[PDB]
Ligand binder design. Structure first.
Ligand SMILES: O=C(O)CNC(=O)c1nc(Cl)c2ccccc2c1O
Ligand SMILES: O=C(O)CNC(=O)c1nc(Cl)c2ccccc2c1O
Ligand SMILES: [Fe+2]
Length: 216
């Protein structure tokens, strides 16, 4: 459903409230997805990303292993127009969920974090996005890896939902949109990536949790 409204009301709200996780495929379409892919790859090739999260040292600094590289995008930067549009689509979508996602009242968003795992076997250890109540209630991730083959490239996002035995494996599939509670209900990890892996994350703020963040 293109109008975010039907998708938000008939799928996203119900899914988030029952599962705390929601997967939406073919969110923007091939044409738009590829345009974002192209903008993200230009950022990388023009050196706009960091050098990567320091994974290992071992006192010889050229034997230092670095992982995910990142860059923060506000949405208006020249050359990042399609990303700004993606961001606007996530926003319109969240706006349609107002008063429906838990008992939260979203009133803000972080800038978009574009992450690129180099594909050198690095990943992201199990973690909780917001474990100390910093205001972030919902994590939103947009994937842009065409023909991703987890069986050969790894890089699967594994979420250990609620506090129930199983976990949920989600492939960083092209044009896929993902939503999940940012707090302790969703510990998760990015398994080792053996191929270049791109994703765009945005975190939405709950009005109350954020307002008291400096005093909690
Ligand atoms: O930029 C601002 O208005 C103040 N920033 C924040 O409130 C803020 N808080 C958090 Cl927890 C994050 C967390 C990640 C990235 C950006 C953040 C951010 O801008
Ligand atoms: O990309 C994915 O499928 C899942 N990614 C994450 O869970 C993730 N989380 C955090 Cl908090 C960061 C934080 C910084 C850079 C990358 C991150 C990341 O990829
Ligand atoms: Fe995360």
């Amino acid at each position: 459903p293109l109008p975010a409204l039907k998708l938000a009301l008939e799928y996203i709200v119900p899914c988030m409230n029952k599962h705390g996780i929601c997967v939406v495929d073919d969110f923007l379409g091939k044409e738009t997805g590829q345009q974002i892919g192209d903008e993200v790859r230009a950022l990388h090739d023009t050196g706009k990303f960091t050098d990567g999260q320091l994974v290992s040292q071992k006192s010889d600094s050229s034997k230092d292993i670095r992982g995910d590289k990142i860059t923060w995008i506000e949405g208006k930067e020249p050359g990042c127009e399609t990303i700004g549009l993606l961001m606007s689509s996530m926003d319109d979508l969240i706006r349609h969920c107002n008063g429906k996602l838990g008992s939260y009242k979203i009133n803000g968003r972080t800038k978009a974090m574009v992450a690129c795992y180099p594909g050198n076997g690095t990943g992201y250890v199990r973690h909780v996005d917001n474990p100390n109540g910093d205001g972030r209630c919902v994590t939103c991730i947009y994937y842009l890896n065409k023909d991703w083959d987890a069986k050969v490239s790894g890089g699967i996002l594994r979420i250990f939902p609620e506090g129930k035995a199983q976990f949920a494996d989600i492939e960083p599939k092209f044009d896929r949109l993902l939503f999940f509670w940012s707090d302790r209900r969703n510990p998760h990890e990015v398994q080792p990536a053996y191929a270049t892996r791109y994703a765009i994350t945005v975190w939405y703020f709950d009005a109350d949790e954020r307002a008291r963040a400096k005093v909690k």
